[PDB]
């Protein structure tokens, strides 16, 4: 009954690696001793309940702290000047100077300035006082309590769901699309139309009077009569001021498009109409699959009979239903890939089409949110590929996938890997070559020789969307175009002015720097996909190790025989692709941050001139914008950014410490620990105190994991202070 | 209720052996501390009446107690708070010496360790402890709901 | 308020120290006979 009760081998392990491996295999429930599928699924269900409880506790904590210690009520009156407060600081290490510097935001105590946009979100959805935030926090706390009770309950004997119920795909998909997506989005549209539009128009609608107050003067009579245009009639005027009745309309569902002029955010009526329409579409979608009545579809039948003629895709999608519904790793990988794509989409769309009031002028929050969601998108994509590899090495059955669409991937994996290698090499060679050419040309005082390629195709797409400065005059940019004529009466009158207005991040102007950095991003994405795809496809075996599936997913090596077999397990292909994930998201965030900093400063010529060469990138972005951060504290004093400076150097330290684990490997440290063991055992007094687990150096995979974690954490903790502190100090 | 004790023990089989949990030793020790705490809040009440505790609007400074003074924060620590906290620190130090130190004399804390048992329930001190702890929970209940403070409630009720 | 002073040390020094002690003792517990 040692600590790794789930692993008898680790329990009998006498060294200190028992603790490490137990901790890191605690959640690998599939490989646990004496584990069954039904128990696995039930334990997963309970852990999901606990996780949801944690999420709602985190949200309730944010709300409570803003309500109690934040200046939400003061910020509501003057959103564009008052700095939002996250929470108070309690630190007995602070000096008087630190307390004075951190006293800010119109409060009498030290505080932290929120950079998450929660103030903007809550103000937009219609929170006006600390009481509303407190009651929301209480509701979320009660929800977390209920979820924890549910997680406890569903592990009970009489309340333990069965494996057939878990594997009921059709009912789950029907409900999680018609209710979880559809009805929830309908509920959000109802919340907007009942509470948010009235609050933006100067009406205090709360639980005590939402029953009495009508969302529309007409009521539901237009809805039941079919005269649904009455709800679009009388939209908000361009002279409207958010939160006040002056210039306010009566429409609840509109398609104006563009942006609200005062807040430079999308119309709440447009957002409500969006959610209503998409809820209708989701509710219709959720009746597809057969559940207990007769109508519907069978996913097994669909997949089985989807096979093209003459065996183009082999046997088609036969057996994919079985593999997907049997293997949880494939489902996890698909979910992670979809969620990573969605996270990239929200990151790309929040800045281009801001939805929350006054967020466009809050430059720190925009950069923080973009960097945050892009990093999480990268993490989710790497996880999706890693779990695909785990599925291949653990849950793939060639007998079931005899000549399947999935098996043909393994059939021509060599071609796939070689072509990924080719495209990666081409992009890298030519992007780096053009960059170095531009560097040398500017270095020799002759910038005229630069190879500057205009992103003609992206500019063409901008023109097709409605941009006019390029002069392409295609589709929506052409006044005569049939597309413009068709859309002229619904959304184009707002969209055209929004896109052509130069004060906005919607379809930013692009140039040779954008061309070059986009091709660098393509290089990085293709190389990350190369590493991950090769890991997934060679996880089962390789010419250097055809029996890799017997060893499994994460093993150290096969020894120095056959020339050396370092980093062969396809867990090491996660490890090696995490570096490229950090690289590509770093390039993306550098690009976003610099192109937005220059535009906020009204100095886009600096980006357009200096972004074409790496010296310009190093000088005008990092070196230039690093001054307010490093000057957070100096010999003469300290500012509110001293915390950010400390963290920049702390992330630097963690990143550098990761290199130790990544470079120096286990034998050196094992011999050193043997010497230390000798010294401890031979010294007097101290030899009375004796360990229980024999100290040993960290395992190979353990130290790869630790070094990668140090690398990643130093990466994020040294870039976040930069992107926040420089943006705060410049305020542009 | 013994069924609930068995359910606990069962669940938490480790904390159980030292007496930590729903145990008679734990109930006795709290009861002792609760009786001492009724005595303590009465002592502070009469001390505040007789202006015993250095008190008033006087507050600490960063130059005398540093970051624990919290000077510049919203919290306004008073010298009466400081001196009562010092008294409680002395109480905690003596208690820690009595607990982790020799069982010089008196009674243990961890069920006398040594695999002793918990003697299920003068020996009326456990009843008094029930009284004292129910009084204390009632006092917090009124201080939270009625919002009528603590020393004021004690004074008006007595 | 005084809740920060009361709670931050309680939850960041006393509780994590007790948690580390409990985890260490539990992982060092040997097999039952």
């Amino acid at each position: 009954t040692k600590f790794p009760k789930f692993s008898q081998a680790l329990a009998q392990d006498p060294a200190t690696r028992r603790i490490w491996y137990g901790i890191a295999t605690a959640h690998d429930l599939e490989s646990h001793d004496g584990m069954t599928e039904e128990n696995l699924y039930q334990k997963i269900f309970a852990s999901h309940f606990g996780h949801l409880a944690i999420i709602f506790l985190w949200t309730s904590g944010n709300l409570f702290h803003v309500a109690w210690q934040g200046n939400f009520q003061q910020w509501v009156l003057n959103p564009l000047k008052v700095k939002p407060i996250a929470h108070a600081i309690w630190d007995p290490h602070f000096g008087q100077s630190a307390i004075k510097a951190f006293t800010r935001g119109g409060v009498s105590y030290p505080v932290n300035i929120a950079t998450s946009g929660v103030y903007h979100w809550w103000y937009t959805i219609g929170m006006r006082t600390n009481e509303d935030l407190y009651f929301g926090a209480l509701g979320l706390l009660i929800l977390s309590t209920a979820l924890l009770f549910a997680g406890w309950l569903h592990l009970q004997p009489k309340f333990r769901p069965g494996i057939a119920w878990f594997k009921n795909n059709e009912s789950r998909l029907n409900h999680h699309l018609s209710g979880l997506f559809g009805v929830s989005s309908l509920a959000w549209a109802g919340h907007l139309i009942h509470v948010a539009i009235p609050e933006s128009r100067g009406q205090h609608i709360r639980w005590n009077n939402f029953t009495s107050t009508l969302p529309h003067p007409e009521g539901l009579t237009p809805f039941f009569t079919g005269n649904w245009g009455l709800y679009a009639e009388n939209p908000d005027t361009a002279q409207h001021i958010f939160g006040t009745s002056e210039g306010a309309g009566t429409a609840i569902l509109t398609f104006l498009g563009g942006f609200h002029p005062q807040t430079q955010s999308m119309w709440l009526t447009d957002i409500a109409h969006h959610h209503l329409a998409i809820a209708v579409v989701f509710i219709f979608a959720g009746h597809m699959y057969r559940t207990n009545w007769g109508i519907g579809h069978s996913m097994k039948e669909i997949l089985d009979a989807h096979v093209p003629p003459k065996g183009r895709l082999g046997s088609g999608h036969r057996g994919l239903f079985e593999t997907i519904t049997d293997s949880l790793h494939m489902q996890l990988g698909l979910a992670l890939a979809s969620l990573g794509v969605a996270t990239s989409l929200v990151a790309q769309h929040m800045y281009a089409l801001p939805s929350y009031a006054f967020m466009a002028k809050d430059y720190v929050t925009q950069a923080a949110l973009y960097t945050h969601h892009q990093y999480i998108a990268g993490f989710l994509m790497v996880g999706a590929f890693a779990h695909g590899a785990i599925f291949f090495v653990r849950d793939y059955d060639p007998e079931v996938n005899k000549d399947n669409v999935l098996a043909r991937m393994l059939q021509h994996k060599e071609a796939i890997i070689s072509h990924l290698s080719w495209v990666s090499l081409f992009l890298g060679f030519h992007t780096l070559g053009l960059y170095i050419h531009n560097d040398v040309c500017v270095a020799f005082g002759t910038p005229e020789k630069q190879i500057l390629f205009e992103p003609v195709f992206a500019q063409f797409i901008q023109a097709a969307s409605g941009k006019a400065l390029y002069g392409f005059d295609v589709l929506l940019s052409s006044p005569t175009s049939v597309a413009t004529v068709a859309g002229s009466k619904i959304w184009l009158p707002g969209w055209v002015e929004a896109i052509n207005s130069g004060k906005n991040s919607l379809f930013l102007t692009i140039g040779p720097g954008d061309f070059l950095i986009h091709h660098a991003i393509a290089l990085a994405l293709h190389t990350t996909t190369l590493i991950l795809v090769k890991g997934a496809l060679d996880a089962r075996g390789s010419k250097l190790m055809p029996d890799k599936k017997d060893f499994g997913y994460s093993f150290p090596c096969d020894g120095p025989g056959r020339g050396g077999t370092c980093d062969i397990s396809a867990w090491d292909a996660f490890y090696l692709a995490m570096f490229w994930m950090l690289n590509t998201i770093g390039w993306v965030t550098f690009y976003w941050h610099w192109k937005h900093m220059t535009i906020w400063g009204g100095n886009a010529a600096a980006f357009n001139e200096s972004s074409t060469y790496i010296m310009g990138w190093l000088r005008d972005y990092l070196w230039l914008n690093s001054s307010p951060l490093i000057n957070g504290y100096n010999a003469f004093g300290m500012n509110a950014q001293a915390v950010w400076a400390w963290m920049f150097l702390f992330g630097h330290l963690i990143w550098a410490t990761g290199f130790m684990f990544l470079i120096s490997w286990r034998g050196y440290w094992q011999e050193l620990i043997e010497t230390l063991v000798w010294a401890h055992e031979r010294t007097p007094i101290a030899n009375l105190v004796k360990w229980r687990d024999k100290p040993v150096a960290l395992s190979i995979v353990q130290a790869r994991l630790v070094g990668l974690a140090h690398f990643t954490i130093g990466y994020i903790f040294t870039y976040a202070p930069f992107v926040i502190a420089s943006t705060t100090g410049k305020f542009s | 209720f013994e069924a609930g004790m068995a359910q606990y023990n069962a669940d938490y089989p480790w904390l159980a052996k030292y007496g930590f949990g729903p145990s008679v030793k734990a109930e006795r020790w709290n009861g002792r501390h609760a009786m001492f705490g009724w005595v303590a809040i009465l002592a502070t009440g009469v001390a505040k009446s007789h202006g015993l505790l250095p008190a008033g609007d006087l507050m600490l400074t960063y130059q005398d107690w540093g970051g624990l003074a919290q000077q510049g924060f919203n919290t306004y620590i008073s010298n009466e708070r400081a001196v009562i906290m010092i008294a409680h620190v002395h109480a905690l130090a003596v208690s820690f010496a009595a607990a982790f130190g020799p069982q010089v004399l008196g009674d243990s804390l961890t069920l006398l360790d040594g695999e002793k048992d918990e003697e299920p329930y003068p020996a009326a001190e456990i009843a008094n402890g029930r009284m004292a702890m129910f009084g204390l929970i009632s006092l917090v209940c009124t201080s939270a709901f009625t919002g009528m403070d603590i020393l004021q409630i004690v004074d008006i009720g007595t | 308020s005084f809740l920060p002073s009361i709670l931050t040390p309680l939850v960041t020094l006393v509780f994590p120290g007790l948690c580390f002690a409990l985890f260490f003792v539990l992982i060092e517990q040997d097999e039952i006979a």
Partner: peptide, 30 residues
């Protein structure tokens, strides 16, 4: 302005959540 009583009832609900979390953790362990 959030009141001390409001913070206290929120803390009580948090303690209830703590007890339920401990129970859920025990049931997951077994």
């Amino acid at each position: 302005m959030i009141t001390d009583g409001q913070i206290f009832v929120a803390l009580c609900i948090a303690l209830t959540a703590a007890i339920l979390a401990i129970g859920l953790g025990r049931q997951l362990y077994v």
